[PDB]
Enzyme design. Structure first.
Site, mmCIF file in Angstrom:
data_model
loop_
_atom_site.group_PDB
_atom_site.id
_atom_site.type_symbol
_atom_site.label_atom_id
_atom_site.label_comp_id
_atom_site.label_asym_id
_atom_site.label_seq_id
_atom_site.Cartn_x
_atom_site.Cartn_y
_atom_site.Cartn_z
ATOM 1 N N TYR B 147 21.541 -25.382 -11.791
ATOM 2 C CA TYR B 147 21.410 -24.790 -10.472
ATOM 3 C C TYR B 147 22.404 -25.440 -9.487
ATOM 4 O O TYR B 147 23.092 -24.718 -8.723
ATOM 5 C CB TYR B 147 19.955 -24.949 -10.027
ATOM 6 N N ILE B 180 12.348 -24.602 1.737
ATOM 7 C CA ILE B 180 11.865 -23.458 2.470
ATOM 8 C C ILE B 180 10.546 -23.022 1.830
ATOM 9 O O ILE B 180 10.442 -22.957 0.598
ATOM 10 C CB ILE B 180 12.874 -22.318 2.404
#
Lengths: 244, 240, 244, 240
Positions: B147, B180
């Site tokens: 990632y 988030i």
């Protein structure tokens, strides 16, 4: 009747970048106090802002003046809840010709003023649980420029200071950020030749010099509710002159 | 209206981006992984948008989707490359497929979709390519080598492309979210979320809207002199 | 008799940077395995290294070859304890002319190979509680270059991968770093004109192109006991072409 | 032999740097804050070095020290600006003197000493200026706004100066230590030290020699193409 808008303080608001930032914050709904080094410069700011701001004379090198100005604002307009530290004075020289004064004056005007003004506004922002400190830095804090060891050191110090302060004040929701302009059209660039402005614009990915309004737009964003989860960052506004 | 294409628009960050860009005045085409998800987007956007199915791993699908947009709505002038899928593992346990699927979904898709929209933006002399990166492209998180590589790749890609396209007034930027609040993080425990928000200077998880606000800024005329940058939206989790 | 030195593996060791790195690691006391894409290239490496290294043919795009090469080294020479991932192949094009193959081949040769080889050597380094993974990156992972979106993405991905891996392996004392060369004199730069080499050297603070040996010197440092507390960093070797 | 000047050479990082540069073949002039400390350095270095008293806050002292070196030993061709003094406080509690004394000791001294050695290095077409920074110029540590500003200032200074001096083959670089074991950190508790080393990827505090090794590298011909950089020596505490 009482002044009810949130108060922003923009230092060096006479022209160029500082002027555009002050005007935009007025447009955004702030009551804006802008500073100039002279009383006549302050009076011009007062004229420009009309009944939604004020001009005050401030030599940011002097602690007593800083303290007097912020107290004046608190007593007349309100707590400083947006602080924009804007300074563009340079005293350039290769290091072998850079005097003690070239060094000290630039570090004081730029970095010491950021330390002093930020410290002075913290109590008000802490009480409000709201604050924006926005430091105008420069691309040269990142991109090496001979002859500006003083200015670069100051601007880089300002960005590091901003990180430190952002960590200290973050639980209270006060954000602390820097905006780093690139080649922005100013009186200084207007004084250069067309050929030299071309040589600058060829280095910018967007193939043009920026405008003071582009910097104002960045400051406006950071000062707004659209940027409440952004802190301790440098927002680069340079048209791709410097990317990473 | 100008057309914006937002990938992965079903929920969380993508959904908030898509809804914001509609509010900003764009005609928004949002994509989902299935025809059914695509219908839900059509239903959400109404007259101001459209939903399309797209597997961003598939070049033929990418070319068909963009062609379909050009034919029905107009040129794609804002492209938001938004992917959040992870296949985490310590390197010792990270398979070839875990590596490849994340590099393809995140970075290859950015290459493919960015390439496919250049022609319309070039003709318009206007464009915004806005790539969703991550704080982890900067701050190493064990288990996310794939990632982190993909997102850092995206950021460098963006810099290169910003230099190529800038004379046409096309900006190319990344937005790097921190922690988030999502369904993913809602699924975690209270202690875990606490350990996350304790790392954030603002002492809270962010929200999808915080990311939408950053993308909206970059997509506007208020950011017309900003290109090749990373806009960090992480609450002071990572400062640079 | 048994091979007793620590083993280093340097991919792409035929010429230039890779050749200098391999030779320097031999000088430092490693037994060095270097790779070339062809068998005849491998045989030249074998010639060069003599009895303190070996040349092996490896197409770093292929997992089966990677696995075969590392197994061969383990069975004949020892565990790979220094891994230098070195690749400089480019397939440049502006994005509008950059094919699927231009993209995939560069990402595979550069970044996928770093993933595969690093993964393959971890067990040996874990058992030793010693390891050095040194990735050759590039200034263009930082400084934007049109036409190299593929190469830049790969090199930047490699640096991020290195950070991730450094965090995972650090308790075992294995360091994972990148070296980012600038303008280094190679066959490629030799093929340019003197005027173009001047235009390059004028951009370098040190006013010259580097040499492969400068990169070898950096790798040598990082592979040594003088760098045991350095991990997850990028060591820039570019003469001041790119600073921050 | 070429002369190296190393400030703050009494203990810890400075002492290890000075001893290493002697082993590397430099004649090392080390400085201490008192005449007594200076004697201890004279006694340590013997025939390969000298100790001088210097308050790096004082320009007249800086000019006298360098002049004394030029007259007795030769031109200063390696300068290592090494300071570690802190005056920590949250900004709300940080006085003018706390701010000024740290900016003067760290950054002003770097300006003054670097300026004063240019002439000799220019004539030689050889020089190494190596500035000791800190991980905290990069990773925000609450309470160290002064120290972090000073060190970041030093790094940017170095970049500027590297561009000015590079044609004369003078390199200017910073070394940024992380958590290094010192008397300061020995004085801390076991739990505190544990919380520090848990942040380090290598899971340990570093040693002064690790810093000396980095400075030795940069001062050698092995780093003759490295200028304007920051060499991070922090065990993966901070990665960039």
């Amino acid at each position: 009747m009482a002044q009810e808008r949130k108060v922003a303080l923009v230092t060096g608001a006479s022209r160029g970048i500082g002027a555009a930032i002050a005007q935009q914050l007025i447009q955004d709904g702030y009551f804006v106090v802008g500073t100039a080094t002279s009383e006549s410069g302050a009076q011009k700011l007062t004229d420009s802002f009309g009944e939604q701001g004020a001009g005050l004379a401030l030599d940011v090198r002097n602690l007593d003046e800083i303290e007097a100005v912020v107290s004046h604002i608190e007593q007349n307009y309100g707590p400083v809840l947006v602080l924009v530290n804007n300074a563009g004075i340079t005293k350039d020289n290769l290091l072998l010709r850079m005097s003690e004064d070239d060094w000290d004056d630039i570090l004081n005007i730029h970095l010491k003023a950021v330390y002093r003004l930020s410290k002075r506004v913290l109590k008000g922002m802490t009480k409000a649980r709201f604050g924006r400190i926005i430091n105008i830095s420069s691309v040269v804090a990142h991109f090496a420029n001979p002859g500006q060891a003083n200015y670069s050191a100051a601007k880089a110090g300002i960005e590091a200071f901003s990180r430190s302060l952002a960590k200290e004040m973050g639980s209270r929701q006060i954000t602390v950020n820097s905006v780093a302009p690139g080649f922005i059209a100013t009186e200084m660039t207007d004084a250069l030749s067309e050929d030299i402005r071309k040589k600058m614009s060829d280095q910018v990915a967007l193939n043009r010099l920026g405008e003071p309004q582009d910097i104002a737009n960045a400051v406006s964003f950071l000062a707004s509710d659209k940027a409440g989860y952004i802190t301790g960052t440098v927002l680069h506004v340079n048209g791709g002159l410097y990317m990473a």
